[PDB]
């Protein structure tokens, strides 16, 4: 039940200035990096080589070392054939990877965004222009679609290699993907617009995995009205989230924060006093 994604980012500002970096995730833990300046993929985890033998990992990394110098060179030929929207500053993203299911098979994907809009995909055996993708991209993909080797090599990485790799990881990573990290919590209140009604704030940080329950309570009374915000990250790969509640003075007494999270059992109830 995990999603392995490998996001690549190519930036082409002009004929002589291109940069392509990449970064892989297993769920919400980053496992690898490939800075444009580094000649080899760097692991960002002890177990990011999966259950791959060096000799096989090394042979795999060579592929990318070859793909890179190439995709990059071919974009330059591509770009000359860029009418009508001749607009050199080109930013292209590529999200590829595979969602790993238990009973089901795994599901693979390759999405490509041009200038931040999604425009092309690899599908089964051929690369295809997705709706909304500009008119010119059609001649390039048709001439690309004649490269049997690439499209065979892709159907391999995509279909076969990706799941092989990913299970290895869920196997070696099991240690850090199963870590139950405990949260911390503190409250604070911010006054609102011009009026005597302020809003109580509950901050909860340092928890992992992502799934956490936070909510304002009045005794056993749950406060409908509490509004949970965005999950913000921390440098240690943990999470941040804060739930606010707009009150009215007077009756802030008795309210409190109940932080429910997997690592605990007997959870944080921070009364406002």
């Amino acid at each position: 039940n995990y999603t392995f994604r490998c996001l690549q980012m190519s930036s082409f500002a002009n004929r002589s200035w291109s940069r392509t970096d990449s970064v892989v995730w297993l769920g919400d833990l980053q496992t690898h990096r490939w800075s444009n300046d580094s000649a080899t993929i760097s692991f960002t985890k002890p177990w990011s080589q999966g259950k791959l033998s060096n000799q096989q990992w090394e042979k795999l990394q060579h592929m990318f070392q070859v793909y890179r110098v190439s995709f990059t060179r071919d974009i330059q030929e591509l770009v000359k054939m860029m009418s009508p929207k001749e607009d050199y500053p080109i930013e292209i993203q590529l999200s590829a990877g595979c969602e790993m299911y238990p009973g089901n098979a795994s599901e693979s994907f390759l999405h490509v965004a041009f200038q931040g809009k999604y425009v092309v995909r690899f599908w089964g055996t051929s690369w295809q222009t997705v709706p909304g993708a500009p008119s010119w991209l059609d001649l390039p993909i048709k001439v690309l679609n004649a490269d049997q080797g690439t499209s065979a090599t892709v159907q391999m990485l995509l279909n076969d290699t990706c799941p092989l790799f990913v299970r290895g990881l869920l196997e070696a990573g099991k240690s850090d993907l199963e870590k139950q990290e405990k949260p911390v919590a503190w409250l604070s209140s911010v006054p609102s617009s011009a009026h005597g009604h302020r809003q109580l704030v509950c901050h909860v940080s340092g928890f992992y995995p992502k799934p956490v329950w936070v909510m304002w309570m009045r005794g056993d009374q749950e406060q409908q009205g509490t509004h949970r915000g965005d999950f913000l990250p921390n440098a240690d790969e943990t999470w941040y989230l804060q739930a606010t509640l707009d009150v009215e003075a007077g009756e802030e007494a008795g309210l409190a924060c109940r932080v429910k999270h997997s690592s605990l059992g007997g959870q944080d109830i921070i009364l406002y006093w």
Partner: protein, 99 residues
């Protein structure tokens, strides 16, 4: 094509005057992936600020977490300044003794 970065400043542990902490600045939703993040303590820049690797969400916008080691003080202000193409001028959100 072009989107203005949403900015978010917050600590890692409950701040407490004098106690060491970590100030996180999470920039997001921007595009292009060309932005200069700057963390400021009272107008001065903090020398060493760590940034994560830039990646993108499935909505294709980018994101990053610049962060540093900080200490909450009754007389000290901290902030995150962002420079992005899609911003006529630099956005500075300061930090509140709560987040």
């Amino acid at each position: 094509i072009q989107k203005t970065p949403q900015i978010q400043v917050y600590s890692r542990h409950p701040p407490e005057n004098g106690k060491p902490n970590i100030l996180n600045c999470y920039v997001t939703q921007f595009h292009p992936p060309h932005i200069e993040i700057q963390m400021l303590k009272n107008g001065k820049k903090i020398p060493k600020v760590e940034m994560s690797d830039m990646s993108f969400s499935k909505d294709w916008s980018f994101y990053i977490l610049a962060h540093t080691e900080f200490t909450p003080t009754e007389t000290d202000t901290y902030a995150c300044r962002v420079k992005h193409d899609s911003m006529a001028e630099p956005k500075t959100v300061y930090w509140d003794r709560d987040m």
